[PDB]
Curated annotation (Swiss-Prot):
This is Endothelial transcription factor GATA-2. It comes from the Eukaryota. The lineage of its organism: Eukaryota, Metazoa, Chordata, Craniata, Vertebrata. Interacts with BRD3. Interacts with AR and CCAR1. Interacts with MDFIC. It is found in: Nucleus. A zinc finger (GATA-type) spans 24-48. It comes from Homo sapiens (Human). It is linked to Immunodeficiency 21: An immunodeficiency disease characterized by profoundly decreased or absent monocytes, B-lymphocytes, natural killer lymphocytes, and circulating and tissue dendritic cells, with little or no effect on T-cell numbers. Clinical features of DCML include susceptibility to disseminated non-tuberculous mycobacterial infections, papillomavirus infections, opportunistic fungal infections, and pulmonary alveolar proteinosis. Disulfide bonds: none annotated.
Amino acid sequence: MAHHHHHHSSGLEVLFQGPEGRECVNCGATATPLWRRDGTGHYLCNACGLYHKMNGQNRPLIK
Ligand SMILES: [Zn+2]
């Protein structure tokens, strides 16, 4: 979740393009990032993969 300078930042699954329901495995795919298959038993968006990094959210290998 993230919010900077908007009264409504309800994209904050990614603060961008997700409805938290077409999102990746953890974060906000809605394309082919950490969504389907690549790493962590799922895919690899760097974001979630980043969430794996310092957040330890998921456990693939970022990309
Ligand atoms: Zn993601």
